[PDB]
Automatic annotation (TrEMBL):
Gene Ontology biological process terms, A to Z: defense response; superoxide anion generation
Localization per Swiss-Prot or TrEMBL: Membrane
Domain FAD-binding FR-type: 1-112
Species, as recorded: Cylindrospermum stagnale PCC 7417
Binding site for NADP(+): G127, R161, T192, G224
GO CC annotation, single: NADPH oxidase complex
UniProt-recorded name of the protein: Putative ferric reductase
Residue spans crossing the bilayer: 118-139
Full protein stretch here: 413 to 692 of 693
Main subcellular localisation: membrane
Keywords on record: FAD, Flavoprotein, Heme, Iron, Membrane, Metal-binding, NADP, Nucleotide-binding, Oxidoreductase, Transmembrane, Transmembrane helix
Keyword Flavoprotein: yes
Superkingdom of this protein's organism: Bacteria
Native organism taxonomy: Bacteria, Bacillati, Cyanobacteriota, Cyanophyceae, Nostocales
Length: 247
């Protein structure tokens, strides 16, 4: 339970990459989320974040936080000010750590992606934190033993309207396309890396992946709004795929 924040990242758009000492009892799956208490902001509140580090990562957890309101802004400050006083001051013995409490892990149906043969992962919006975790572990599982893993093709389609806070995620995807030696991944990005503008024609993306994998079964993992959820379930049923909604 009791731990510390062992680094930060002042990532664009006020986003806060974080490094959290992973307790020896703390073993999580990909996409799992956390409840965190930082006493120096609130002695009382807990707040929830998805872990953005595959559980293959050894002895840290990375949390990409966005300052969007009180505790997250107060959080950002206790960092920039905690960091900016090691630059115009720089008393460099070693860095200290921000004591924080953590509660979890709490699960997601994501663990089923690793069990399925083909797979459509769709993030509409900004719930992309768990998908960064997932897509890393897929990398590691593919490397360490790609025969051991049923997941043979991952189709990733991402819809955001603006990526300023998410320039960290874009990089990470490019990395995945790099070490993706086996062409396990089909990453697509759409704006609402030369990526695609406008709404995707889902009728065709599903019609295409279908042909890619006949007569095998495909599983959809949707993570977005409900009016998109409905369109896809009708496509799932029209090509006989397999649907579930995360969050
Ligand atoms: C499962 C889960 C995973 C999450 N993962 C992440 C993650 O990876 N990264 C991350 O940054 N966050 C994540 N969050 C969100 C995070 O838990 C919250 O943003 C957190 O509580 C910080 O909120 P706050 O108290 O700092 O700001 P708040 O003051 O609570 O801000 C809440 C947001 O709603 C707005 N708002 C709503 N109603 C009003 C109103 N009446 N008046 C004014 N503003 C209003 C605020 O302006 C602000 O945008 C996650 C949440 C969940 C449930
Ligand atoms: O889809 C809905 C929604 C649903 C119903 C009604 C209205 N909106 N939202 C509203 C609630 N959000 C979250 O809590 C949430 C957030 C974030 N990351 C999440 C990851 C997983 C789960 C939630 C979040 C953020 C991540 C981030 C950005 C940059 C760096 O890290 C930013 C803060 C919000 C976002 C999606």
């Amino acid at each position: 339970e009791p731990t510390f924040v062992v680094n930060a990242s002042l990532l664009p758009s006020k986003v806060l990459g974080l490094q959290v000492q992973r307790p020896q009892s703390f073993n999580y799956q990909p996409g799992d989320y956390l409840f965190i208490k930082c006493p120096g902001i609130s002695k009382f509140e807990w707040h929830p974040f998805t872990i953005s580090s595959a559980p293959e990562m050894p002895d840290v957890l990375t949390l990409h936080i966005r300052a969007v309101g009180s505790w997250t802004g107060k959080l950002y400050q206790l960092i920039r000010e905690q960091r900016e006083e090691w630059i115009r001051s720089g008393s460099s013995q070693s860095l200290p750590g921000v004591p924080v409490y953590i509660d979890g892990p709490y699960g997601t149906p994501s663990t089923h992606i690793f069990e399925s043969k083909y797979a459509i992962l769709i993030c509409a919006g900004i719930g992309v934190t768990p998908f960064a975790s997932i897509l890393k572990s897929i990398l590691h599982r593919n490397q360490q033993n790609p025969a051991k893993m049923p997941l043979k093709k991952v189709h990733f389609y991402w819809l955001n309207r603006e990526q300023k806070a998410f320039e960290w995620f874009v990089e990470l995807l490019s990395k995945i396309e790099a070490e993706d030696t086996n062409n396990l991944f089909d990453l697509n990005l759409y704006l609402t890396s030369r990526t695609k503008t406008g709404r995707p024609d889902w009728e065709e993306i599903f019609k295409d992946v279908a042909k890619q994998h006949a007569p095998d079964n495909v599983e959809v993992f949707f993570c977005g709004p409900t009016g998109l959820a409905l369109q896809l379930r009708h496509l799932c049923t029209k090509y006989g795929f397999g649907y579930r909604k995360e969050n």
